[PDB]
Design an enzyme around this catalytic site. Sequence first.
Site, mmCIF file in Angstrom:
data_model
loop_
_atom_site.group_PDB
_atom_site.id
_atom_site.type_symbol
_atom_site.label_atom_id
_atom_site.label_comp_id
_atom_site.label_asym_id
_atom_site.label_seq_id
_atom_site.Cartn_x
_atom_site.Cartn_y
_atom_site.Cartn_z
ATOM 1 N N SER A 127 0.880 -1.197 0.000
ATOM 2 C CA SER A 127 0.000 0.000 0.000
ATOM 3 C C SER A 127 0.917 1.248 0.000
ATOM 4 O O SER A 127 1.686 1.388 -0.951
ATOM 5 C CB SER A 127 -1.018 -0.079 1.117
ATOM 6 O OG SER A 127 -2.017 0.922 1.090
ATOM 7 N N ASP A 173 -9.767 -3.867 -5.034
ATOM 8 C CA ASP A 173 -9.185 -2.909 -4.076
ATOM 9 C C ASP A 173 -9.984 -1.622 -4.065
ATOM 10 O O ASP A 173 -10.100 -0.974 -5.101
ATOM 11 C CB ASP A 173 -7.726 -2.664 -4.424
ATOM 12 C CG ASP A 173 -6.935 -2.039 -3.304
ATOM 13 O OD1 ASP A 173 -7.550 -1.204 -2.529
ATOM 14 O OD2 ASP A 173 -5.729 -2.354 -3.245
ATOM 15 N N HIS A 205 -7.855 -5.006 -0.656
ATOM 16 C CA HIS A 205 -6.610 -4.239 -0.347
ATOM 17 C C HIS A 205 -5.722 -4.946 0.676
ATOM 18 O O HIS A 205 -4.513 -4.726 0.677
ATOM 19 C CB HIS A 205 -6.980 -2.851 0.183
ATOM 20 C CG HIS A 205 -5.793 -1.976 0.364
ATOM 21 N ND1 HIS A 205 -5.047 -1.544 -0.729
ATOM 22 C CD2 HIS A 205 -5.314 -1.349 1.488
ATOM 23 C CE1 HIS A 205 -4.098 -0.755 -0.251
ATOM 24 N NE2 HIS A 205 -4.228 -0.640 1.105
#
Length: 257
Positions: A127, A173, A205
């Site tokens: 991320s 996501d 995610h």
Amino acid sequence: DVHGPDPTEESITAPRGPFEVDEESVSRLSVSGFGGGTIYYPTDTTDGLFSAVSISPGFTGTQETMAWYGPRLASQGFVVFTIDTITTTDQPDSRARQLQASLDYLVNDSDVKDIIDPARLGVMGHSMGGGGSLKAALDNPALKAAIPLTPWHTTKDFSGVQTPTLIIGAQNDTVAPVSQHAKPFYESLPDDPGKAYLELAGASHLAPNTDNTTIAKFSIAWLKRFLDDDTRYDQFLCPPPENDDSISDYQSTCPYL
């Protein structure tokens, strides 16, 4: 140096590779420029130097969210450093500087500096840490592999990255949608020395934060191929996989030559 026997589908998908591993905790108080972490490393000293990779968590995450990568990757013959950031709210460009500080610690100061090949270093991250991995590669073209996992960054142009880069996206996501983050990053990258985009079917995610055979298989192959220059692992990367239920999209600049 390459490491381990000729790979198979079973060997690369197994929870552990052929190398036994130990772990060294690195205190936040003993380092500068990042938050400490855990070094996972092979115990065999008779097989030459190992390549090393540092792994960043994402926004509000700690190393616990990336711990599973440690034993999984190090047991394939790698030194793996799951880091903490200074604060869990650090932004991507800061994460990039902390990844690099962690690699500088590993090579210059750590108690594994004598079993690492300082010329074979990579970055990975989740991320905002995946955005950090892209920025760290941009700023340090010596890095030999990057694996941004469900990456997030406000910066979209990584045309300057000369490091072989495997971007792993999550199909569904909602935090770092692949249309706004992973795919633009992937399209900006140069075709050489080698890039790939692997989209995880059905994935959220947070898919990177739990043991994932698809993430493990392709990360191992990518680090073998590009940190170790081990062309035995081209067979898993090129041409791209076709009938993998776990993969909703795969783009590449295969073959990597």
